[PDB]
Design a protein around this nucleic acid. Structure first.
Ligand SMILES: O=P(O)(O)O[C@H]1[C@H](OP(=O)(O)O)[C@@H](OP(=O)(O)O)[C@H](OP(=O)(O)O)[C@@H](OP(=O)(O)O)[C@H]1OP(=O)(O)O
Ligand SMILES: O=P(O)(O)O[C@H]1[C@H](OP(=O)(O)O)[C@@H](OP(=O)(O)O)[C@H](OP(=O)(O)O)[C@@H](OP(=O)(O)O)[C@H]1OP(=O)(O)O
Ligand SMILES: [Zn+2]
Ligand SMILES: [Zn+2]
Lengths: 454, 384
RNA sequence: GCUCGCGAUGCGGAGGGCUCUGAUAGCUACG
RNA sequence: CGUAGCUAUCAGAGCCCCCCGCAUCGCGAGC
């Protein structure tokens, strides 16, 4: 018992409360300890849990790691063990994302800070870990409704936190390309190099890490957290409520007029989309025409971390993937929990999704049910807006520099199809899933990406 | 040693309370502390002397959503009357093993071979459910207080509210109607904070008044069993209880053979019980005839205080069922539907029970009372 | 007879904080 | 042999705080 051992180890220790926050089950107190001259702390929804984790941090830093809680143990990246000890990275990136969220909501006071799932992307450039940078912050645990889907690329289909965070990572990527391409002076400050095999690659040792307040829905979350001692089915988000249900191994594929007479919109679960990302990259098809594949190095969970189930959800379940195009791969990033994981607040989901990318001055708020911002407009994150960025980047890069031949681009879907190797990796991923007994990916009716900018 | 409805009601209440006392060291144990007491009493004839207490339980809480077990090791619902049914199930399994041991032991079993296939109760074996208060939901919600000759009947029998399916909600108070087009529960949704929903006891007892008290699995061995009486020790309201237990689903149709809409005797007792003072215990006790001692389960976790599975949990019941299954000759099964050994699938092998359950769900829907709210399917996807 | 909105008085499982009592456990102090 | 105290847990009676459909009455409107 942590404080008991800490006060039978250096028995004169006095604990300092700093700042209480929240209401009902969403409340947290911060507790601190001074022992052997080092300022420690933990977090917890009641005092005697925050103090317990503060004591655990003290004894970890001085003496030793406590109960080698066995599913609480982190897989490690195949390549890039560069940002030092996995727990120290995990705790750093969760703290960074929580701090940026605080800044973005009047120090957790704005009405938009009441959220169920927080998420974020954090960038490192160095083996040194003190030089991180929060790239994007998002919330949301909800999805557009059948009657609200856009044919003009003007509505966010998925507003779950992880997903919104990735779209903000795409906004950051377009900004970085435009930065490299606006001045020979600014090329030194872009995250991108000219690449030897063509187009752009990331400057060496630039890596991105993904934080989610909880485990992604679907497969990484199908376990009992109080008995950790197994069939990675593709699952789809149920419209209406939070949570997912497994893909039906035989049922008809969606079409645009069918989501308005008999059925709702079937969106893939966040586990599946992250697994997807671990093969095709986090940059999607359109960016791939300009840059070499980008993969996350870390998936840090602020709760419901379980090493086996997350391993399965994120890469192991599709180990059977074959013949990936060049530079694609089965990314096996670092997976970790955090120390003072947050608590389960049993309540109804918020209805808004918050997003912010580094560069912007303020968060943007989206009704996840209509995929529009709460006075009825298109998000900076939506299909149409990203495509607008992409068109502006295409206009500045010579026809030689492209990673794919695409000339005179008009329609979204066709510009996506121009990304031949990425579509190849997409097909390989789909087949891996089918052949593993895990169901077939549900794709949207291709009419909703059938739109020009005009 | 006679019959009269009020005589019977008082007799079963005395027996359950007395047996509870015997089990709790004359109510001096820390575990005697209870808000709600429930039990099952078995009769075999007209002599009140012949009544036998089968199970006793307490509890007023249900499992915390974070503690759901995907291996069937946790009790989901510790309201006393639900626990009392599960304890009776243990008894039913024991009685089948008694029948199967040998021809001499067979005489003592409450089961006999059935002419329709499988087994059925011997003539005049009856079970009676006792609850120290009105079951939550439809029977309880519109008057959660003791009745007085002065207060009228329900001044509003025709409100939409009357008869609706309702759920307990985790961290919520009261029970709630199912919403118009209420969306299905998911394992990952509950884990992330969607509040776990459980059907109210009023709704569960009505279900048992259609599909029987034995559950699906036992129905693979035995014909449907019904309560002959429901005895409340306090907060009796005749019109609400009668509506809740059956009258609300008098529109049910097309039940499979041997199923019926059972309308048991409903009664209060002559000397109504009192409110018990005290913060309500977070634990639940259970006992079945033949057990040496009570079992104490933390209702919020669904396991005992050392984290062990209850003798009443799904996994334990699946084990009892599997042992009997290996002993019953195929020609004696009531169903010959082969299904893979996963709790969910074995239940599906009880085809007629599933049909009766379907008629029940439909009765509620067509009556305007809402749709039954089931657990995430992942709950039952485990094997021994 | 209901249904909906607003108001009013009440009724019926969570989280958190401050006290009072009992039990265990570990560590001090003093005679 | 004691008393005193300090933490860590449990167990139990209090005081707040804060959440999360139903009853009774009134007003408006509708079926
Ligand atoms: O961030 P998400 O909400 O998960 O969006 C993705 C993304 O679409 P956009 O970038 O156009 O929004 C995928 O696009 P690419 O990765 O190919 O660039 C697209 O897949 P396809 O365009 O390859 O079909 C997929 O749609 P889906 O998998 O249903 O076809 C869609 O996810 P949602 O449709 O669920 O928003
Ligand atoms: O009396 P309870 O403790 O509430 O248990 C019942 C029982 O399940 P178990 O016997 O496995 O504990 C029902 O099973 P049947 O005997 O009726 O077949 C099951 O209904 P299903 O038939 O769908 O399994 C129902 O679960 P659900 O509420 O999802 O219908 C579940 O109730 P709880 O989940 O409330 O314990
Ligand atoms: Zn999700
Ligand atoms: Zn109940």
């Amino acid at each position: 018992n942590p404080v008991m051992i800490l006060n039978e180890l250096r028995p004169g220790l006095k604990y300092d409360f700093l700042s209480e926050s929240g209401e009902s089950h969403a409340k947290s107190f911060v507790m601190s300890v001074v022992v052997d001259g080092q300022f420690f702390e933990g977090s917890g929804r009641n005092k005697k849990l925050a103090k317990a984790r503060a004591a655990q941090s003290a004894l970890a830093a001085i003496f030793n790691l406590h109960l080698d809680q066995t599913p609480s143990r982190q897989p490690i990246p195949s390549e890039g063990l560069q940002l030092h000890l996995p727990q120290v990275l995990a705790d750093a990136v969760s703290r960074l994302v929580l701090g940026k969220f605080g800044d973005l909501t009047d120090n957790f006071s704005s009405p938009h800070a009441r959220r169920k799932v927080l998420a974020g992307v954090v960038m490192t450039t160095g083996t040194d870990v003190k030089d991180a940078k929060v790239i994007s912050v998002s919330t949301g645990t909800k999805c557009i409704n059948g009657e609200y889907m856009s044919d003009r690329g003007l509505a966010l289909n998925d507003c779950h936190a992880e997903i919104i965070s990735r779209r903000s990572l795409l906004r950051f990527l377009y900004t970085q390309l435009e930065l490299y391409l606006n001045n020979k002076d600014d090329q030194k400050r872009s995250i991108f190099q000219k690449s030897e095999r063509g187009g752009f690659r990331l400057k060496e040792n630039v890596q991105f890490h993904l934080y989610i307040s909880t485990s992604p829905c679907g497969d990484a979350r199908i376990f009992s957290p109080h008995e950790p001692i197994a069939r990675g089915q593709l699952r789809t988000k149920i419209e209406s409520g939070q949570g997912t249900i497994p893909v039906r191994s035989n049922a008809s594929i969606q079409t645009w007029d069918g989501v308005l007479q008999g059925e709702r919109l079937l969106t893939m679960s966040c586990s599946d989309k992250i697994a997807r990302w671990n093969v095709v990259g986090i940059q999607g098809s359109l960016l791939s025409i300009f840059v070499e594949p980008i993969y996350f190095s870390s998936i840090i969970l602020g709760s419901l971390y379980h090493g086996d189930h997350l391993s399965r959800a994120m890469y192991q379940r599709i180990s059977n993937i074959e013949d990936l195009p060049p530079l694609y791969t089965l990314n096996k990033p670092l997976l970790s929990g955090i120390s003072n994981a947050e608590a389960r607040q049993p309540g109804k989901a918020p209805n808004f999704s918050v997003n912010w990318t580094v560069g912007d001055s303020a968060i943007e708020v989206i009704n996840a049910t209509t995929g529009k911002d709460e006075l009825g407009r298109a998000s900076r994150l939506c299909k149409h807006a990203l495509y607008c960025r992409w068109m502006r980047v295409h206009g500045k890069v010579p026809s030689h520099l492209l990673r794919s031949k695409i000339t005179k681009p008009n329609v979204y879907h066709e510009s996506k199809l121009a990304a031949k190797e990425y579509q190849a990796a997409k097909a390989r991923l789909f087949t891996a899933f089918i052949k593993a007994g895990l169901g077939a990916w549900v794709e949207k009716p291709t009419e909703q990406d059938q739109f020009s900018l005009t």
